[PDB]
Amino acid sequence: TTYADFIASGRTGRRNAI
Amino acid sequence: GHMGNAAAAKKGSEQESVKEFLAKAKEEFLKKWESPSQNTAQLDHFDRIKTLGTGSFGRVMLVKHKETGNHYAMKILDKQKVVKLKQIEHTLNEKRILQAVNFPFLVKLEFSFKDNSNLYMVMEYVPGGEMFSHLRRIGRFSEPHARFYAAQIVLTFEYLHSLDLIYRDLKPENLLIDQQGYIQVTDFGFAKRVKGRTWTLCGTPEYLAPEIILSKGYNKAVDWWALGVLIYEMAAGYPPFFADQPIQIYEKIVSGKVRFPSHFSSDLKDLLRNLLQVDLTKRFGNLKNGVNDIKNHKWFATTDWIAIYQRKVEAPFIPKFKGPGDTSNFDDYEEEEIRVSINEKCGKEFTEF
Ligand SMILES: Nc1nccc2c(S(=O)(=O)N3CCCNCC3)cccc12
C-alpha cells in the first residue's frame, strides 16, 4: 500500500527543514 | 450561471469587504514593521519550568511570569550559534514579523529582550502541542476535521500575503493547537517580505513547491501548493510526495503525479489537483480570482469563513489540560541550565533585536 511505502520511507517522524 | 443574482451580489460584496479589512490590516502592520518594539522585559522576570521543544538555534521553554503568574513559551536563541549557523537575518526577521503582525491564528509575541549570551522571544503559551502529534496519534483527520484546520490556514495565508509575506514553512510540525482547538502558527524564520519573486531554496522537502526546487524564481503561490500538501497529509495521514531521500522526493514533486486514497471525496481530490498544480498559470490561489478560487471551492461549501475567523465554530478536538502549565501534550527534552556569559557576544550583529 501507499501507507506501507510511507512507513518504509523512514520519514514518518518530525521532518527537518533543509 | 453558477450563482443567481442574490448569491453573486452577496459573494462579491463579501470579497470587496475582505479587501477593505486587509488594506487596513496592512497599514497597521507597516506602522509596526517600520518602528519595531524592543527590550520589553528581562530574564529575571520569569521562572523556567520545562523545555517544550529544541532546535538548532536553541530552546523553547515553558516559563511563568514571576509577577503576573502567567505562563509563556520563551524561545531562547544562542547568539554565537545563530551566527555560526549564519541565521542572523532569519532570527531578526522572525522577531520583526512577530511584533508587527496581528491575526487570530498567529502566535502572540508578548515580550522580547536580549542579554550577553542569548536572544529571548516570550510568546503566549499554546498548550495543546503540535498538530503533528495529534495527526500521527489518530492516523488521519476526517475531511470535516481537516477542513476546519485548512480554513484557518487559508485565512492566515490570505492575511500574510496581503502584507506581501510568503510563509514557506507550512507543515503539521509547525502548527500548534490552542486550548480552544484552533490553530496557532509560530515559526517565521523562513518568512520573507516579497512583492514580486524570490529564489531561496528553503523549507521542508515534502512541502516544497516544484518552482522552489527548480532554479526558476517563485512567488506567494508556493504557499498555496504547501496548503495542498497539508490538506492531503491531514486527510490521508501521510504526505502526497515521499521517498527515502529528499532528492527522490523532489523528483516526484516536479512530476506532480499525485495518487489519492480511495477514501478521499471527489470534492477533495478536485481541490487538491488544483492546489498541487505544477503549472503556475493554473494553480488555485495564483489565478485572477486569487484566494477566492479556494474559498469558493465545493469542498469548502460548508465552511462559515466569518465564524472561523471569529472562532465561533466548535472545534472537532479539544486538547486535554489538567491545569495551568500542563505540558502533557509535548514531548520530553533534556533539561540544561541557561548560562549567561560575563562578556557580551555578537552585540553588533543583534543591535536591532
Ligand atoms: N507559543 C508556543 N507555545 C508552545 C510551544 C511553542 C513552540 S514548540 O517548542 O512547540 N515548537 C518548536 C519549534 C517547532 N515548531 C513548533 C513547535 C515554539 C514556538 C512557540 C510555542
Three-state DSSP string of chain B: CCCCHHHHHHHHHHHHHHHHHHHHHHHHHHHHHHCCCCCCCCHHHEEEEEEEEECCCEEEEEEEECCCCCEEEEEEEEHHHHHHCCCHHHHHHHHHHHHHCCCCCECCEEEEEECCCEEEEEEECCCCCEHHHHHHHHCCCCHHHHHHHHHHHHHHHHHHHHCCEECCCCCHHHEEECCCCCEEECCCCCCEECCCCECCCCCCHHHCCHHHHCCCCECCHHHHHHHHHHHHHHHHCCCCCCCCCHHHHHHHHHHCCCCCCCCCCHHHHHHHHHHCCCCHHHCCCCCCCCCHHHHCCHHHCCCCHHHHHCCCCCCCCCCCCCCCCCCCCCCCCCCCCCCCCCCCCCCHHHCCC
Written as one letter, the residue type at B55 is G
- Using CB distances shorter than 6 Å, the residues near ligand 1 are B 52-53, 55, 60, 73, 75, 107, 123-126, 130, 173-174, 176, 186-187
Q: Ligand 1: which residue has its CA nearest to atom 14?
A: B174
Tell me if residue B331 is catalytic. no
Nearest to B125 by CA among B319, B271, B339, B346: B319
Q: ∠ at Cα B267 (B263, B268), nearest 5°? A: 60
What was the experiment behind these coordinates? X-ray
Nearest to B204 by CA among A12, A16, A11: A16
| Cβ atoms B15, B292 nearer than 8 A | yes
Q: For residues B319 and B11, what is the distance between their CA atoms, to the nearest angstrom? A: 35
Q: For residues B283 and B276, what is the distance between their CA atoms, to the nearest angstrom? A: 7
Q: Crossing angle of helices B266-275/B221-236, nearest 10°?
A: 150
Segments making up each domain of chain B, as ranges: 18-35+130-320, 36-129+321-351
Asked whether the beta carbons of residue A18 and residue B204 sit closer than 8 angstroms, the reply is yes
* Look-up of cell digits 518568512: B191
Cell numbers linked to B156: 492566515
| Cβ atoms B324, B70 nearer than 8 A | no
Q: For residues B162 and B173, what is the distance between their CA atoms, to the nearest angstrom? A: 25
Nearest to B234 by CA among B313, B171, B291, B184: B171
Cα distances (angstroms) measured from residue B182 to each of B147, B162, B345? 12, 22, 39
CB atoms within 10 A of CB B206: 23
Q: For residues B95 and B87, what is the distance between their CA atoms, to the nearest angstrom? A: 13
Resolution in A: 1.9
Q: Which of residues 127-186 of B touch A (CB under 8 A)?
A: 132, 136, 169, 171, 173
Cell numbers linked to B96: 520583526
| Cβ atoms B213, B254 nearer than 8 A | yes
Q: For residues B277 and B287, what is the distance between their CA atoms, to the nearest angstrom? A: 12
